[PDB]
Structure formats: C-alpha cells, structure tokens
Amino acid sequence: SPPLSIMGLMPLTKEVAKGSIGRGVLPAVELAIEQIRNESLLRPYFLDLRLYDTECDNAKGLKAFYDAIKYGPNHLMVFGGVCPSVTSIIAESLQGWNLVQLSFAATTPVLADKKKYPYFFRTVPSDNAVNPAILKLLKHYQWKRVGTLTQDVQRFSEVRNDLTGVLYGEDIEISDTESFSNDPCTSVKKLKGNDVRIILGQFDQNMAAKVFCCAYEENMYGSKYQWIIPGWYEPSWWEQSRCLRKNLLAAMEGYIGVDFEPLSSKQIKTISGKTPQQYEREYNNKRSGVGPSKFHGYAYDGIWVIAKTLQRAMETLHASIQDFNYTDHTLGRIILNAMNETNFFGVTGQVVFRNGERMGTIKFTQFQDSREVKVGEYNAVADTLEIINDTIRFQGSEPPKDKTIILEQLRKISLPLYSILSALTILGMIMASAFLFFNIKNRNQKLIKMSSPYMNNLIILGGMLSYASIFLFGLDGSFVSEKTFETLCTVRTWILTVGYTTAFGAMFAKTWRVHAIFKNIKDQKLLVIVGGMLLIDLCILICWQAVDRTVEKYSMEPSIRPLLEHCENTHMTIWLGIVYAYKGLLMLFGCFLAWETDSKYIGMSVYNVGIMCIIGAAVSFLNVQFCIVALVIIFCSTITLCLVFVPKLITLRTN
Amino acid sequence: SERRAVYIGALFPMSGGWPGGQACQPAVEMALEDVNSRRDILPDYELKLIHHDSKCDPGQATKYLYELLYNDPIKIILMPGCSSVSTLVAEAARMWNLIVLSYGSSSPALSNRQRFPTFFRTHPSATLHNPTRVKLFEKWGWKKIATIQQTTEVFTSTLDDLEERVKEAGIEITFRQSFFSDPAVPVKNLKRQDARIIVGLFYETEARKVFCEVYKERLFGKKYVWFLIGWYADNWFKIYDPSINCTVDEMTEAVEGHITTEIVMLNPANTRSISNMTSQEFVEKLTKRLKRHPEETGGFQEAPLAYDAIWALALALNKTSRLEDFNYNNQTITDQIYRAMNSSSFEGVSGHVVFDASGSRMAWTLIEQLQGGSYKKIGYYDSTKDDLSWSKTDKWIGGSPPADQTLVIKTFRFLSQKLFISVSVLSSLGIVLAVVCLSFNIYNSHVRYIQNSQPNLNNLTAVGCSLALAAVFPLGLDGYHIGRNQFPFVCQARLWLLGLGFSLGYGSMFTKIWWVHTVFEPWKLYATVGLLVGMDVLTLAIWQIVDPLHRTIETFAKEILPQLEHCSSRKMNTWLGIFYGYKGLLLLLGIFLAYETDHRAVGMAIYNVAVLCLITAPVTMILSSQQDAAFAFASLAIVFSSYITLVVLFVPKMRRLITR
C-alpha cells in the first residue's frame, strides 16, 4: 500500500508536559488512525506517520527539523500546536521545503502571522472572539461600560493586544482597560477607583494568587465586581497567602472563566459516525492512562480531519502521483487546494476553517468555587453563546452593571410635624390678632401714662407684624418647587426679620424715651426710629436682591445616593454680619435698660430670640435637623410674643 | 601552513537592513581573502568560505542554512549583522554549536547569554553610551530623566536598557513615556508632563513624524530637549519629506543642537591596521571594491567592522596558530575555541578589539549635538572609561549642558520693609512714651488736691503705654524682618506680643468705680482690674494651648523660576483668635458703659480713647493683612495719641488743682 510518510512529530516526551498527554492522545489518534486503518479508507494509503515526539527542547526540535529533512523521509504536514517557540520555528518553516502545513491546536494568535501563516495553518485559536460571547454577555450580562486589566504575560500581553483587537467595533463603553504585572492591590485600588463593577483578567494561575488576594481586599462581591478568565489560567487553580481562604473560595465562587468547548455536545455518531459519546467512552477508556490531552476531543478530531482533508486532496490528486518531493511546488498548490478546501461538517462541529479558524464553540463557566457552570458556548457559527439556562449562579439577578449607581437626593422634612408647625404658627398669629382686637376694641381705660403707657397698642401692633411675618417665613420650609429658585422666599424671610426688628425697635425706643426721661408725642420719634430701621432694611434688601439662594447644596449619599439642596446668597456673610450688627444695635440698649432697672423681661425675651437666631445660623451649618431647628426657633419666637402678651394679660386679670 | 579551506559559514544579507555590506562582505571577504592571502601568521588553513546570500530570506535563508548544516564542510561562523533569523540561529547554535558571528547587532537581544552562549557581534547597546549619556547627563548635571519612544521592539529592548541604566544610574527617571505611531497626544501629555529634560527613540521616518509633532508642539526651549543618538540619518532630519506638513524652517531651527551621537564606528585615526592598512587606506580599498554607488554603500561603516571581523577570525586562528574532528556535536575543539573566546580580546585597528561581556565592541564614542545641525561631535566616550573627550563645542542651554529638572523657584518667605518708617516711628514713639512716663512720675509722688487724692489710674495708663512700647519691640522688625534670627527669634517671638497684650486695658479700670460713680474703697476697683487680668490669664492659657504661632505663609509664585512663600509668619490656632474677639467684646462692653456717662472731661478723653481702641479693632480684623509688609502698627500710634490726650488732661489744670 502506498505509504503516507506524515510529518507526525511534535513535542511529546514524557517530560513534555502535555506532550506526555500528547502521546496520551497519540494512541487515540493512532486508534483513530487504527480506525482509519480499520477503515483502510483511502487505500492504498499506508499511513507511515514519520513520528517523533519532539520533546519540546527548542534545540531538540531544531535537530529534529534537521533530521526530518536529512534523514527524515517524505513526511506530510504539521503534527503541531505544541511548542510556541518551535512553533514559531515552524512558522518560519512554513514554505521551507517548498513547505506548507498546518497544526490546529494552539490559540497563540501569534499564529496570526498570516504573512508567515501564509504557508501554514491552524484552527483552534485565540478566544479573543469571546468578546462576542462577551458581547452576547454585553447582551445577556447586559453591560456596555466595562474595564479590565491583565498580568500582561508576553502571551497575556499579546492577549491584551488581542483585547485591543476585540475593542474593534466595541459598540459599548470600554469603561477602562487596565493591566498589571504583579501590582494587584495597587491596581485593585486603582480600579476600585475605576468604579469596580465587573472584571476580566489575563494572568497566571500563579498571578491568580495575588489576583484573588487583591480581590478579597476589595471583596466587592456583588454587581460591584465580575470574574472573567480562562482555564488557560490553569484548571483547578482555584482548587490549587493573604486572602481569606473563605474569601478565596468567594473569588472562586462566581468565577466566570471559559475555555474551549472540548467536544460536540451532541455526543452522537460523529462526522466519522463515531458516537461521540462512545467516542469519548473509548477515549478515556482505551486511553487507559487518562482522558487524552485536553485537546483529546480536538486531538482525535484533528486525527480524523487530517484524514478528511487527506481524502479530499486524495480526490483532488486522483485528478492527476505518489512521487512528490519537497520540490513538488505543484503538490503545494494541491495543498492550498485542500486548504481552501479545509471545511466540512467536522465531527466536534461543522469544522471549517474561517481563515483557518476552527468552526466551533467555547465552554464558558461561572465557577461557584466548585460549581463551574460551563453554561455557555458561543457557537462560532453564530458565536451563538448557547448558555445552559438556569445554570446561572448569579449573586443578584444583576446582569453586569455598566458602572451605574443611584442619584441620592437630599431634601429632608417631616411635613407633618412641619404641618403641625404651620398649624401652630397660624394659631399664634390668629390668637395675636384676637388679643389685639380685644386690647384695642377694649381700649377705654387708657389708664397707663407713667408706666408702660396707654399707647403701647402700637408696640403690640409691631409685635403682631413680627409674629405673623415669622409664621410665614417659617412656614416657608420644604416644598418651594413652585418656584424654589431664589423663590423670593428670600423676601419672605426679609419681611419676617422686618416685622421682627420692628417689634424689637418698639420696646427699644420705648425704653429709650424711658431711660431718657429717667435721667432728668415722642411716639413720632419712636416711629422715626422704626422707620430708619426699615430703611436700612430695604437698603440691604435691594442689596441682597443684587445677590439674587436657590435651594442648592451638595453631598454624596448612600443604598447609593447623592444629596444636594440649600438656599445660599451671594453675600456669603456680608449680609450676615449686617444682620448681626443690626441686632447688636438693639441688644446693647436691651442690656443697658436691663441695668437701668415691665418690658425688661420683654428685652430679655428679645435677647433670647437673638440667641435663637444664633442657633439658627448653627442649623444653617447643620437638615431636617435644621428644619426642626427652625421650627423650635419659631416656637421661641411666638413664645416671646405670648410672653409680651402676658404683661398685658396682667391687666385683663386686673380687668 | 597548509591552507586547508575551512568551511566559513557565510550568507550575505543580500537583502538586509543595509543590503550593501552584503557586497562589502565579499570586499571584507576580499579583505579576508587578503587575510587568506596574508595567511603568513598561520596559513595552516584556508577558508572554505561557504558563501551564500543571507538575502533577508529569513525562513528560506534558514532553509539554505540547514542545507549548509546539511552540507559539508565542518563550518565556522555566521555571516550576520542583523538579528531576526540570525538571532534564531543564535538560539539554535549549541545543537550545532559554531561561531556566533554577527557584527552589526547592538540588539539587546544579544543579552540572552543563556541562549547567547557563543555570542559574537561588534555592535552593542548605546545604553552604555546612554550611561555615558548619563555621564553626559552628569556632564549635563542632569539627574531627572524624561523620555519616550515609538515603541519599536528595538525601542522596546531600548526601554529595557534604559531601565537597566536608570537603575544602575540611580538618577531620577523623571519620566518614562513612549509612542507607537504618533504620540502627539502623549506629546501634549509631555507638555502636561511639563517638559524639562527630554529624550525619545524612533526610526528616521518615525523620527520624521516625530520632529513633525515636535515642530507642531513648538515647545522648543531649554525646557525641550532633543537628546537622541545616531539611529536616524542627518538628512533624515536635515532633508525634509513631502509626506510632512509642518514648517521645515521652524522644524529645521528645532533640529539645530539636537543632542545625539555615535560610537567610533571605525578606526578614528588612519594608522596602519593590524593588517598595516591605513584607515585612510581602508577607505581607499573601500572605494576600490566600491564597484557600485558609494551612495549605495550599505553597511559602509559596517564594512569596517566587516574586514575587522575578518582579521578577528584570523586572530582566533593564529591564536590556535587537523583539529577538524568536531561535529555539530563533537565538542573538544569546540571548547578549545570557546576558551579562545573567553580569551577573545585584542587591539584591532578599527579599535582596540573590544570584547564586551558577549564580545561586542567598545571604544570612544563621538558625541554631537546637532550643532547648528552641523552636529559637532564634541565628545568621544573612551568606552574604556567611556571617557568622553569633551571637545566642548556646546552651543546649548546656556551654551551649556544644563541639568535636568530645569526649574528653580524662589519663595517670599518673609519681608522687612527695612521697617524704615516703621522702626523710625517706633523708636520715636518709645522715646515720647518714656518721656511722658517720667513726666507724670515727676508730677506724681506729691499731691492730693486733684479730682480725688491719687493718680493710681496714671499707673494703669503707663501700663498700657508699656504694652504699646513692648509690642513695638515684639511685633516690630527683629523676629523675622530686618534682623535674621527667627529659628530663635520667631521661637522667642511666640511669647513677645502675647506678654504685652496683658496691660492693654489697664487704665480703663477706673470706669468701674466710674460706673459706681455713674451709680453716684480702692479694694473695689482693685478687684475689678484683678478680674480683668484674670480673664486675660484665661485667654493666655487658651493661647498656650493654641500655640505655635511663628508659622508658615503664604502660597504664591514669583518671577529663572520664582515662587513666593509669601511671608511665613505668626500663625496658630484661630481659637485664640476667637479668644481675642472675646477680649475685644469685653472692650466694647466698656465702650458702651462709657457711652452711658474734669473726671467727666476725663471720661470724654476716655471716649476718644475707646474710639481709638475701636480703630485698632479693625487692624485686628485686618489680620488678612494682604500688605502685612505695609499694614501693622497704626494702632501703636493710636495708643501714642491716646496717652498723649491722657497726659494733656493730667498736666496743666491738674497741676493747678492737685499740686499748684
């Protein structure tokens, strides 16, 4: 039978880490070969795979290539996807012996050297496309604003290059793209600052140590995080010291990794009619030392697929014979023929070569620290991220948040104690109006001259103005939304303090003329004093009208929020010191006449109200707290008011 | 002896970065042939100069290579200058284990001593030059490193070597930027990175786009720094490209003085070679073999290293001065030559044949800022010491190799104003004050026929005046102003002002009894003033808590950088500030008490006095004291005029009444 010297050589020593398992898949492929031999399908092909476990020593592979040429017979093509270094060697070798061949195994998008990968090919490649699945996630996990980092191993560096590649048409906010070498906690902070909500990393299972470490540091185990990686970062690495072994498992929990979908889910009669179930049965079993090297599925796949393209070009060559040498450039043309023809309903999947690209899907698991829910496999056909429904072990129902939160508004009022407050304020003002109607409507025994004289009803009126204007501007609490934009409640407080200072100056000029006569009609002069008060008042009123205390403030809040509301004027303390001075103007004469000696207690209550205004400034520094503070302020205000009323009520007792 | 043709592993980079030495190879081979001719030293073999064209066919090159490995005879070495495929074979050697022979690869790639076992290539990283450039930085006094690079894998290796040196340097790697294609963005970032000490790495055309970006930024100044090396060509700078858009004039201007260099790329002098050839005669022979355009002379300067390597092979030969029993394996003579390699170092005519750690060359390094674009190679780093012959052609920052981190700002840490008018009026006031004190004392000691029978209040008046004088001394110009003694003075100053404030309100004490007289013995007003002093001591403890006053101030810049730490001065906890506000509150209390009420004329004087005190309160409130250098001490004169009115009262009719 016309033998088939095949370039059946790859790094497969027992020392060769998976290369041992490579031999562990050799037998299987050999079995496949034996199967093919059992098939004897493309006789007279007597498949003489010129075989050499290349043992992975770069120089060993060198001398291999060497003898392969010199001593080695007319072998066929790339038993490969083994040793990235010597891979590259082959990459160079691509057209070497007028050469051309293909592995299919390694994801090393180093393979991308279509320049070099002109005269060579491969199928199982870099899962950067998982981005699309991730896009599917961006669909399914419903995110569009994400950042990531990597321990940029020259691979993982190249991987991040591929990531940038994936950022092609990235119709979603690549909310960041960090990276790392070892500075996990450092980047951990950096990215907590990047509003940690989701995470993908290219790092060593080794590097994974510090990874999980910085993780448990942040530990933002919620929609404030996401775990994304690959079994490339070694299998059982989580199964494989800073973080809590608890928090370690926590990281392993929900750990969203992914790798190749090892084989066809429908474990049916393969494209080779092999019940892929029975296929794998025999695989593990006859394998008899393991299940074959992780590519076991892809391993025997490539076996049969070599065979496939083999029979394909076998037809294409029956078109023409077995005398090909390395000189046979036309045979290389026929190779390119079967190469363009690298496409079929491959067993593991309708294995075609989308620019050499394996036609497949990729298992995607969310490790719940052992529940590696390999739910998803982007059927590269559609990259149809076939997810095992309900396999989701999602912390919340949160499909990946895209760096979002919640606007926490400030505003703080009870509106009922405040309703009760407005009620009581109206009550005080109304009782004031009533008692005044009495005192005037009953002002016939105008029996006070050489005392608080019988004309103090005017002062009572000034007090009524005070207390009413107070009721209003205090009832100016929390729903100004009608205007709430320098809503002229400025003028509310303005008229408030106006009536206030009016009532104040009433007793002021009273005691003024009083102590004056006490040394050794004047209603006009007192009215003049109050008028000058109101004059400076309207002056500063226009002044702050130029300032023109829309309710605006600022704060962040939790349950995540941000508070902002307060009325503050352009005169940050200018008008403030102004009011302070206006007040001291009275408080002085107050304490003065207090020393001079009825209305002394009135001046006392006034100074009390001054201390109250101080507390109000404090509340301005202070929320609904400050709201109740203003409430208590108005309370003390009406309190001094009724206190004044009680002095008159003494006469009602006399009455 | 017997010129047994030794299989000489030769594939010329017929295509190559400089695929013209590929020819010069033959010429160097000619030289070698000349050597093979002048085999007198040890003719005991010839070269089976297995000649091929490297031809940049990297993969196919390697194919033919193997073919040679697959071919006779027992071969010698590499015909390499550039790495990639060579580098591959270099990794490969041990398997066959032959002479790692490039020359024109400074490639940090050379460093893989593990892999780079047989390494042999003249070109070496100018990082040492960079380190010499560090020395030059030293010669610049530069110690703060700002750099970037179009991230060539070359420039990658660079960035490493950079980092290598920077570590070895232990100098401030002030900035490590980079580039890939057009970092004009990162250029603006460097603007943001606040350019003072600049260097970058790219290729003549990458360099072209670079200079384009440069002229764009136009940030040319002693801030900017065109620190470079001879990776590109002069014309690559000097000649302009149509693909550009910037101002070849402006950019040209920028190009001048651009710092760069190149090692001594050939025999500097024309001495008779190791082959008794003049470097002149070298260039002669160059021209001789120059059968094509000397313009088209690829590896022209390299051809120097080429025939050099010819002679160098010859050196190893005459060292060995048959042993052919080596295979790609058989390692006896292999190790023999390996020793000869550990022994490989000489004095070649191109330069004292210098084996770097990996045998690479080493010699003086011409060093040329693009001196008016006539890059004056004013340095020659004798790699032995990298001893830069500093020919000092520097047309540079000051004409000068200035230092890195070009920024040196001032600070207005204080001021004095000479206290000129200040200290003047200060001495004047102290004089008049002591004068009035003695005058009243003379008026004192004998009288009873005045308002009462004792000017005990004159004492508290003098106390306030003493406070005034003391503060003139205390917060004057002898604690951080004219006199330079703060480290103690400022320290001692912590007390000075404080002390004086004590006597402040002394004279006002009478008011209390006057208030009592407003009601209308000495124990009453005595206890009153005692309580005043007690409040004073309370605030003094508050200050002792609120201490550390002689403090820093105040942020500002200045106009050769300038800053203004404007007048670092008395500054402590504003708690004591509020305490002073409270003291002034008590004062205003006294003020109103006066507003209430001879002794009446005395009280009117005291009213004017409280008015002056109110004035002083503003200067207090003028603590802002923007022009503090022109603000303080008006209140001292206030106190002066106050005590003046006091004595004016106490003088004439007071004598008439009390004494005479």
- Token pair of B324 as six digits: 């052919």
Whether B306 has its CB under 8 Å from any CB of chain A: the answer is no
Burial level of A389, CB count in 10 A (0-12/13-18/19+)? Answer: exposed
Nearest to B66 among A66, A116, A592 (CB): A66
Distance from CA of A593 to the nearest CA of B (A): 11
Q: Do the Cβ atoms of A66 and B69 come within 8 Å?
A: yes
The β-bridge partners of B557 are B563
Q: Is residue A156 part of a domain?
A: yes
- Same domain, residue pair A58 and A202: no
Suggest the residue from B56, B57, B60 to mutate for an interface test with chain A (most A CBs closer than 10 A): B60
Q: Let me know if residue A1 belongs to a domain.
A: no
Q: B455 to chain A, minimum CA–CA distance in Å?
A: 29
Q: What three-state secondary structure class fits B258?
A: strand
Distance from CA of A232 to the nearest CA of B (A): 26
Within 8 A by CB and 6+ apart from A319, the residues are: none
Q: Is the peptide bond before B186 cis (omega within 30 degrees of 0)?
A: no
What single letter denotes the amino acid at residue B12?
F
Whether residue A412 lies inside any domain: the answer is no
DSSP symbols for A176-204? ----BSS-HHHHHHHHHTTT-S-------
A349 and A373, same domain (yes or no): no
B266 in Cβ contact with B301 (< 8 Å): yes
Does A96 sit within 8 Å of B59, measured CB to CB?
Answer: yes
Chain A nearest C-alpha distance from B189 (Å): 18
Interface check for B88 against chain A (CB to CB < 8 A): the answer is yes
- The reply to whether A335 falls in a domain is yes
Say how many C-beta atoms besides its own lie within 10 A of residue A168's C-beta.
8
Give A201 to chain B, closest Cα distance, Å: 24
Tell how far CA B528 is from the center of its chain: 64
A59 contact residues in B (CB cutoff 8 A): 91-92, 94-95
CATH of the domain at A159: 3.40.50.2300
Query: Which residue from B59, B60, B91 is facing A58, i.e. has the nearest CB?
Result: B91
Looking at the partner chain, which of A70, A93, A588 has a beta carbon nearest the beta carbon of B59?
A: A93
Nearest CA in chain A to B70: A70
Resolution for this experimental structure (Å): 7.6
Residue range(s) defining the domain that contains residue A312: 6-124+271-357
For residues A337 and A466, membership in a common domain is answered with: no
Q: Does one domain contain both A146 and A56?
A: no
Query: Choosing among A60, A66, A120, which should be mutated to test the B contact, i.e. which has the most B CBs within 10 A?
Result: A66
Residue A205 domain-assigned (yes or no): yes
Characterise A613 by phi-psi region: left (phi > 0), alpha (psi -120 to 50), beta (else).
alpha
DSSP E strand boundaries for B220-294? 258-263
For A86, phi then psi, to 5°, come to -65, -20
Q: Which residues pair with A46 in a beta bridge?
A: A3
**A408, part of any domain:** no
Measured CA to CA, the distance from residue B526 to residue B515 in angstroms comes to: 14
Cα nearest neighbour of A70 on chain B? B70
Q: Are residues A502 and A624 in the same domain?
A: yes
Neighbours of A13 (CB within 10 A): 16
Pairing of strands A101-102, A120-121: parallel
- A377 shares a domain with A352: no
CA distances to A180, B2, B159, B191, B645 from B126, rounded to whole Å, are 29, 42, 12, 27, 85
Is B188 within 8 Å of chain A by CB? no
Q: Would you say A82 and A40 are in contact if contact means Cβ atoms under 8 Å apart?
A: no
Best mutation site among B56, B62, B64, B66 for testing chain A: the one with the most A CBs within 10 Å?
A: B66
Annotated binding site of B for baclofen: 83, 106, 123, 203, 302
Are B142 and B393 in contact by the 8 Å Cβ rule? The answer is no
A173-201: burial string, b at 16+ Cβ within 10 Å, e else: eebbbebbeeebeebbeebeebbbbbbbb
The two structure tokens encoding residue B438: 């003695």
Q: Are B464 and B504 in contact (CB under 8 A)?
A: yes
Among A62, A107, A101, smallest CA distance to A84 is for A107
Q: How far apart are the first and last CA of chain B?
A: 140
* Cβ-nearest to B66 among A58, A69, A95: A69
- How many whole angstroms from its chain centre is CA A104? 38
Encoded tokens for A46: 């007597």
Q: Is residue A403 part of a domain?
A: no
Print the SS3 string covering A249-316. HHHHCCEEEECCCCCCCCCCCCCCCCCHHHHHHHHHHHHCCCCCCCCHHHHHHHHHHHHHHHHHHHHH
Is A65 close to B91, i.e. CB distance below 8 A?
Answer: no
Angle between helices B420-443 and B634-650 (to 10 degrees): 20
The CATH number given to whatever domain includes residue A490 is: 1.20.1070
Residue A199 inside a domain? The answer is yes
**Neighboring chain A residues of B58 at a CB cutoff of 8 Å:** 92
List phi, psi (to 5°) of B342.
-50, -30
Please enumerate residues of A whose Cβ is less than 8 A from a Cβ of B: 58-59, 62-63, 65-66, 69-70, 89, 92-97, 116, 588, 592
Residue A134 and residue A117 share a domain: no
Contact state of B59 with A65 under an 8 Å Cβ cutoff: no
As a whole number of angstroms, the distance between CA A386 and CA A388 comes to 7
**Same domain, yes or no: A174 and A187:** yes
Annotated binding-site residue numbers of B? 83, 106, 123, 203, 302
Strand, coil or helix: what is A375?
Answer: strand
Q: Other C-beta atoms within 10 Å of A114: how many?
A: 11
Structure tokens at B559: 């106009």
Same domain for A538 and A556, yes or no, is: yes
Domain count, chain A: 3
Measured in degrees and rounded to the nearest 5, phi and psi for residue A101 equal -170, -170
Q: Which of A315, A339, A357 is the endpoint of a domain?
A: A357
The one-letter amino acid code at B610 reads: A
> Which residue stretches of A319-453 are H helix?
329-340, 417-441
Q: Distance from A62 to chain B by nearest Cα, in Å?
A: 7
Residues A345, A198 share a domain: no
* A187 and A319 both lie in a single domain: no
- The residue of chain B nearest to residue A60, with distances taken between CA atoms, is B95
Token reading at A229:
């990686």
CA distance B227 to chain A (A): 30
Structural element, H or E, at residue B376 = strand B376-382
- Cα–Cα dist B516/A106, whole Å: 106
Q: Which residues contact B331 (CB under 8 A, 6 or more apart)?
A: B97
Strands, E assignment, A380-487:
384-387
Question: CB of A413 within 8 A of CB of A626?
Answer: no
Residue B409 zone, left/alpha/beta (φ > 0; ψ -120 to 50; rest) = beta
Residue given tokens 């040492």 in the structure block: B128
Q: What 3-state DSSP class applies to B136?
A: helix
Q: Which of A63, A88, A573 to mutate to test the interface with B (most CBs of B within 10 A)?
A: A63
Domain match, A378 and A521 both: no
Amino acid present at B479: G
